[PDB]
Amino acid sequence: VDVYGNPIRTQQLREPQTSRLAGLAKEFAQHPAKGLTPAKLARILVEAEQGNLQAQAELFMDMEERDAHLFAEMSKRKRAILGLDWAVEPPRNASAAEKADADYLHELLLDLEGLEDLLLDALDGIGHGYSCIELEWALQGREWMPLAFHHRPQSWFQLNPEDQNELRLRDNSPAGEALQPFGWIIHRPRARSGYVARSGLFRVLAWPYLFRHYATSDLAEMLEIYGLPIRLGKYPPGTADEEKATLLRAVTGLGHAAAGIIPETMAIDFQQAAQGSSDPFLAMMRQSEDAISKAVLGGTLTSTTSQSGGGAFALGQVHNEVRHDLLASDARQLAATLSRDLLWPLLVLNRPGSPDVRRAPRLVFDLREQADITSMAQSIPALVNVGLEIPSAWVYDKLGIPQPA
């Protein structure tokens, strides 16, 4: 069975759950970001709270695509995880059989192509609040294998009417369809405590995005109007339609044309077009960008930048507060999700027996922080000459150097 105890039947693993839903694969995103107003955004969020996640997912995708600063921040945050070395470790004080199981799982993950793509797809749940990856199960003889990992759009799911924390497929029915066991890797990182609909970071970032969009569009319009002044022509009674058209064309082309002549009975008045500055717009854009930076990566390095300054402890100063905390949180949550969803089916299908769930191997990301070799290498000799018996295992582990074999 799975970790949650639901019965597992190997018959349903031959075909993906969504195969019998050919309607989903033919859908196109509705792009709800175009022509978006604060009222529309509020309605979208409220409806999403009630189980209509399609519009929210499409809006989040558009928001990711249309904002360069937000996209850069999210990409940097995800690439931070994608570059971490990982390993599979056996449970606490594991036995020989458990060690062998962990070693086999580690070897299987090393030789499993598409792991990086799986991690990238799973990390989308950081912003979207939940990411679902469908599994393709195949048999190369007697051992089950994940053939491929398919990332399904968040717009394909909904909320259970009887449960606000349980996701279901959109199968044209009011209650949707329950997710098949062992058929998905659902990643639901928890930045804030609440239901799944409210758990996305883009829900926090939506309003600054709209503020920045409005400011940028208004600035573009004002830059378009800038330049020549608006000038209005006046004509006396008894001016025919042809003369009216001639005066109109003359006024229209007068800005580009340096000189022109009109009868003394006519008049042209040059009125202010748009006089001001870009200061308000740019102030709003900077405020929104700082808010986005703080919300995504913390207000110590991105928005209120940590500035330059090297040194042996500079790595620690830059990392440990804020950056290390965020990195560790994301890595630990991703590792927990993976150990729950991918490691367990492999252990319970590819190996004999029914090992207890509490003793399953856990995927661990390498969060080791580079320690100053020079300072500590200076420090040891004094301590050892004093008489302290420092274990070599601690040194080898903390320095990153492996133990002799």
Distance CA 260, CA 196 (A): 67
Of 129 and 176, which CB lies nearer to other proteins in the complex structure? 176
- State the amino acid at position 22 in one-letter form: A
Contact of residue 368 among other proteins, its own copies, none (CB under 5-8 Å per partner type): none
Name the segment binding its own copies (CB under 8 A); options: 12-20, 96-104, 112-120, 346-354: 112-120
Alpha helix positions (H), 83-200:
96-110, 115-123, 125-128
Which residues of this protein are in contact with other proteins, per CB under 8 A?
Answer: 43, 47, 50, 52, 172-174
Name the segment binding its own copies (CB under 8 A); options: 12-20, 21-29, 176-184, 345-353: 21-29
Q: What is the nearest approach in angstroms of other proteins to the Cβ of residue 20?
A: 10
Does residue 40 bind its own copies (CB under 8 A)?
A: no
Q: What is the nearest approach in angstroms of other proteins to the Cβ of residue 203?
A: 19
Of 51 and 189, which CB lies nearer to other proteins in the complex structure? 51
Q: Which stretch of DSSP H or E encloses residue 362?
A: strand 362-365
Contact of residue 389 among other proteins, its own copies, none (CB under 5-8 Å per partner type): its own copies
Residue 177 DSSP SS3: strand
**Nearest partner of 154 among 185, 173, 132, judged by Cα:** 132
Does residue 355 bind its own copies (CB under 8 A)?
A: no
Q: Residue 238 corresponds to which tokens in the numbers above?
A: 């008894």
Distance CA 224, CA 64 (A): 27
Q: What is the nearest approach in angstroms of other proteins to the Cβ of residue 171?
A: 9
Alpha carbon distances (Å) from 397 to 81, 99, 220, 254, 403:
21, 19, 56, 78, 8
Q: What is the nearest approach in angstroms of other proteins to the Cβ of residue 177?
A: 12
Q: What is the nearest approach in angstroms of other proteins to the Cβ of residue 172?
A: 4
CA dihedral for 198, 190, 30, 73, sign (positive or negative): positive
Does residue 307 bind its own copies (CB under 8 A)?
A: yes
159 backbone dihedrals φ, ψ, rounded to 5°: -105, 145
Q: What is the nearest approach in angstroms of other proteins to the Cβ of residue 26?
A: 16
Of 173 and 354, which CB lies nearer to other proteins in the complex structure? 173
Q: Which 163-192 positions form the footprint of its own copies (CB under 8 A)?
A: 163-164, 190-192
Q: What is the nearest approach in angstroms of its own copies to the Cβ of residue 100?
A: 16
CB 43 within 8 A of CB 32: no
Residues 6+ apart with CB under 8 A from 246: none
Burial 68-86 (b: 16+ CB within 10 A, else e): ebbeebbeebbebbeebeb
Contact of residue 9 among other proteins, its own copies, none (CB under 5-8 Å per partner type): none
Contact of residue 100 among its own copies, other proteins, none (CB under 5-8 Å per partner type): none
Alpha carbon distances (Å) from 307 to 261, 313, 318, 343, 369:
61, 15, 10, 42, 21
Q: Give strand pairing partners of 388.
A: none
Q: Which 335-354 positions form the footprint of its own copies (CB under 8 A)?
A: 336
Residue 270 DSSP SS3: strand
CB 160 within 8 A of CB 176: yes
Q: What is the nearest approach in angstroms of other proteins to the Cβ of residue 168?
A: 14
Does residue 228 bind its own copies (CB under 8 A)?
A: yes
Of 9 and 190, which CB lies nearer to its own copies in the complex structure? 190
Q: Which of 46, 87, 100, 178 binds its own copies (CB under 8 A)?
A: 46
Contact map string, positions 73 to 92, toward its own copies, x by CB under 8 A: x-xx--xx-xx-------xx
Contact of residue 395 among other proteins, its own copies, none (CB under 5-8 Å per partner type): its own copies
CB 271 within 8 A of CB 229: yes
Q: Which of 172, 257, 352, 354 binds its own copies (CB under 8 A)?
A: 257
Of 172 and 307, which CB lies nearer to other proteins in the complex structure? 172
Does residue 240 bind its own copies (CB under 8 A)?
A: no
Q: What is the nearest approach in angstroms of other proteins to the Cβ of residue 5?
A: 22
Q: What is the nearest approach in angstroms of its own copies to the Cβ of residue 300?
A: 8
Distance CA 196, CA 130 (A): 7
CB 29 within 8 A of CB 181: no
